[PDB]
Design a protein around this ligand. Structure first.
Ligand SMILES: Cc1[nH+]cc(COP(=O)(O)O)c(CN[C@@H](CCC(=O)O)C(=O)O)c1O
Ligand SMILES: Cc1[nH+]cc(COP(=O)(O)O)c(CN[C@@H](CCC(=O)O)C(=O)O)c1O
Lengths: 401, 401
């Protein structure tokens, strides 16, 4: 009986733990369809061309590694704001925003969570969509806020239950906080339609709710970055001052370098200044200043015309491939003779498919075929390659037959 | 009256803010002696040779950027443990430790702070030495613990007030938490003597206090890394199970890449396993997984014999230079005709000198000479170069005359 005799065995992360389990299997045909990580058509980690050139630029310049200001790389901070808001945006033009480099999406989310905990005097409730990325709970819960829920997904119909959402949302207490996924909702792969978004705006505005946008997949919903930032831009434009978290982990394939940002849209550039002051203060006693590599790479691509353009081509490339894989998946299922309707697989967008498989099926999949996915039936289509869509489909079928 | 009408202008970080102020001065002779950042003899940011080769190795291998496990790079985690504990260590050999990659020193410190908040059921008090790095307060305070103090520095005598420390320490309530700087105490540059450390061990052990070591400057106290880890090793060896935070920001000049680690010494490898589980759980909803670059670079140097050896030469090189600058500083002061005893400047170790200048003098220094330092009179000798020790000394003198 020492200091930690009492500390119990905590369980493995529902998402990140799949990769740990996957790592150990000896099956040569194994597939890691758990975390949303882009794999190229060979089924290999893919580092974009533009990322590769960004890094070379950095190398060549023989840059130092001195500490970055607490808020991050100005150039990256400003270009991230700009990427979300759009260059024409009044918010951006007027400087009514504060963007701070964050430790990827998760890092940004928690900074905001912490910021709200401290400065959002109107409420302690955060409404998450049913269902949501498992991690939104703990992120909010550890920061000190309460979690609530709003209906979103209709499993019966494999789509968004708009009526349920609107009902739930029209009733959230005023001045509460609502978390919205900007695009490629995780894990359903179903976003509201633009008409739909417009109706949500109204209710949010009307109920005077703080809209918190989680934008982890800008460019993976349509394959177009501006198109994917529509909702977000629409709300700001309707006069809704949101807070936002951005991740460059998927769209730039910067996973491990941890590049991201957290933004608050304020009333004036002077409020923006005061909020920045306080955000610095929160970040300081947390990690002091942020990791420079991801931010340097992203800044160079973003601010370098030829780089940026290459990047957009590369993003289309990625989404495209994901599409082909959905398609094929479905085809192979029919080929295999599957009786089930697998239309949701091609209807869903972003990196995954919310399959509907029950936990007994998931289990079999891992054990008989060594195909790893989250227990909720969510699979990452992002990680399928031409060489194993066949295998995937056959398995799905066997376990479903 | 929007959401953030109430959020007030927070002040600039007492340490990091000096660099912000410094950045704006137009004086061509300006000197940034605030943050502890190594400058080469030309007064330029210095990226070690071995760091440069580590990066080239990485480049050459065309490594991916997939996400690292929540606890960090195994290789880096294990080599950090090893760097602190020493290779012969029973703790290490036996695997009674858990080391987790942290976002530099600050990142590691806060992870531990958070861990204790959650699992240290014996107390909410953390005793810091008087004085300490300004940031220890907020780090502990934001995590949820209470701050206490123990006497350390004797300004009258420009040294460690051992009697006061021992008195204060012999009285801290049992099972409390005491933060100790492993070496190169920040900001006094005065460490306990080995005899002294031995006496501290006893009292800590006797009072059954949780010893929390902050090891930010391993190699900057003596210019020898094992020598600098003595105290730390001695406590573990006396049967004191510490928690520790390591930073590679100064000794490897990795400032902005944010590489560091947090370790807990446990009873067995099985407790170690349970603690790891819980640490993962804490990190997950905080930043998810850590920045890979700093960790990849540090892992390669540490685990690469020729790299490691080069690294130790480079560390000696750095400490040496710091020594020369102290020396010279003092010489120039006499040359200038300073009446004061400046012996503390050469007596102090690590990257700074706790000068004793009053705030009015600090102020003049910045305004007449554009020499930036923290308001407490702490200056970073680390950043002085042969070309400006003269200027420095003349200024000090003018403002002191
Ligand atoms: C909605 C969502 N929001 C934020 C993030 C933040 O990611 P990062 O920048 O790494 O902090 C992720 C990653 N979630 C995918 C990646 C694995 C993970 O969970 O992490 C996933 O759901 O598989 C999200 O899916
Ligand atoms: C005692 C101490 N502990 C931990 C750290 C953590 O540093 P990092 O790995 O960057 O998180 C520092 C840096 N403190 C010097 C560097 C500037 C800073 O304060 O940050 C300093 O005191 O100037 C310390 O001086």
């Amino acid at each position: 009986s020492s200091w930690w005799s009492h500390v119990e065995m905590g369980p493995p992360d529902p998402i990140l733990g799949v990769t740990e389990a996957f790592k150990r299997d000896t099956n040569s045909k194994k597939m890691n369809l758990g975390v949303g990580a882009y794999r190229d058509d060979n089924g290999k980690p893919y580092v974009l061309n533009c990322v590769r050139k960004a890094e070379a630029m950095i190398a060549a310049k023989k840059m130092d590694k001195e500490y970055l200001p607490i808020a991050g790389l100005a150039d990256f901070t400003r270009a991230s704001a700009e990427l979300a808001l759009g260059e024409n945006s009044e918010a951006f033009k007027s400087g009514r925003y504060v963007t701070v480099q964050g430790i990827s999406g998760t890092g940004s989310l928690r900074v905001g969570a912490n910021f709200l905990q401290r400065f959002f005097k109107f409420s302690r409730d955060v409404y998450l969509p049913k269902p949501s990325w498992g991690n939104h709970t703990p992120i909010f819960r550890d920061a000190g806020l309460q979690l609530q829920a709003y209906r979103y997904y209709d499993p019966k119909t494999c789509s968004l239950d708009f009526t349920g959402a609107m009902e739930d949302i029209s009733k959230i207490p005023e001045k509460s906080i609502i978390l919205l996924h900007a695009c490629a909702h995780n894990p359903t792969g179903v976003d509201p339609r633009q008409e739909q978004w417009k109706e949500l705006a109204s209710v949010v505005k009307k109920r005077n709710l703080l809209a918190y946008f989680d934008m982890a997949y800008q460019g993976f919903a349509s394959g177009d970055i501006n198109r994917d930032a529509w909702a977000l831009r629409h709300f700001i434009e309707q006069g809704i001052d949101v807070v936002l978290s951005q991740s460059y982990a998927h769209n730039m394939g910067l996973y491990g370098e941890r590049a991201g940002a957290f933004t608050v849209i304020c009333r004036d550039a002077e409020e923006a200044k005061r909020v920045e002051s306080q955000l610095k203060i929160l970040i300081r006693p947390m990690y002091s200043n942020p990791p420079m590599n991801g931010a340097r790479i992203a800044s160079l691509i973003l601010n370098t015309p030829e780089l940026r353009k290459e990047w957009l081509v590369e993003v289309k490339g990625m989404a495209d491939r994901i599409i082909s894989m959905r398609t094929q998946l479905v085809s192979n299922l029919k080929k295999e003779g599957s009786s089930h309707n697998w239309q949701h697989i091609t209807d869903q967008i972003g990196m995954f498919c919310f399959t509907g498989l029950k936990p007994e099926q998931v289990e079999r999949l891992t054990k008989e075929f060594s195909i790893y996915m989250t227990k909720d039936g969510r699979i990452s289509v992002a990680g399928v390659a031409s060489s194993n869509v066949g295998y995937l489909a056959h398995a799905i079928h066997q376990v479903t037959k």
